[PDB]
What does this fold into?
Amino acid sequence: NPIEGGVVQVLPYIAVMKDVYHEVSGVKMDNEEVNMVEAYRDPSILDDE
Amino acid sequence: TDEGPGEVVKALTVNTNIRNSNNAVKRMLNYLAQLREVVHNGYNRPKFGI
Amino acid sequence: TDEGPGEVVKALTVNTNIRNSNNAVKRMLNYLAQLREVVHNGYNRPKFGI
Amino acid sequence: TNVVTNTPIDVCKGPDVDGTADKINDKKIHVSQGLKEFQVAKGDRVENEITE
Amino acid sequence: NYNEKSQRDFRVVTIGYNLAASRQDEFAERIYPTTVI
Amino acid sequence: YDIVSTNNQLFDGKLVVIPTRAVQQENDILSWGQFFYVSTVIADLPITRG
Amino acid sequence: YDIVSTNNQLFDGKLVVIPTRAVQQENDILSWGQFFYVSTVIADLPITRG
Amino acid sequence: FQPDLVGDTRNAVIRFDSDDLVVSGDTTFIDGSADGVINDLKTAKLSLRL
It folds into this structure.
């Protein structure tokens, strides 16, 4: 519609996070955050021992 | 939050189920490696414990 | 303790409600402090963002 | 005693739960969340706050 | 203004996200058939 | 023979041929491997961490 | 004019004159300020703190 | 803070853009001393808009 003049694309997903504490002097949270869809190609991202 | 868990709570099962398939692959590959070693060595007859 | 804080729990709200009035006074005084600087400074006409 | 004259209070029930094992049907399941948990919908109500 | 153009109202396509996994997939099931214990 | 495929990263570039029984029975020793599964459970409990 | 008073120690020895709309409406920009009140949330959890 | 319009929905983006910051002869440095550039601004009866 000319009243809108554009589109917004909103992508929901589930992210896999590691159990990681925030660092005192870290530049960024070191927590491999990946899309759950990745587990279909590389399921090893889910392994936990 | 009084509202219950969202549908994402079922992703705990999906996550688990994917891990199940991954474990099957790892067991397969590690099993093949262990078999390769046994057949490489002098084990060409049935026996218990090899 | 099986008996919950029957009326004492309401003190949590009275504490909160007093803090609400205190914020109004602090906000007013801090707002006046900004307004004094802006009108002391040469902003004698309507403008955005000052 | 404490008197609250006119204050809207929202009292949470909390998680009324027991941490007991609950068996699941894992045979075949799926997940499908929507945008609600993000409220980014309703016609992208962040830029579309004004429609006039 | 002289030209009032829509820079804020937009359509939202609300992308779906539907994922699933069986107890184990066809590859694992044929190799390691499931037995309930 | 029959053909089964995986997209697991660990299995890329591999072809493995394994026997199985033509008709699969429950808890059949003649299956190449077995997946022994006990019903998964979910626990839901508020926990204080740290 | 109308006279409103407090005993807040922060606002001691001050007179501040501010306009407001003679008849107060809901969410009226013509009020000198606004207090936006959402809720006070009460929560009760047996937390093992420490 | 403003919501991040493009990117992760939980990002909060700040874009502070002001041409109206004032440094007059009345302002002090964090030390509390008005000296140097500010002193010259005071004697020149000038104020800077940054």
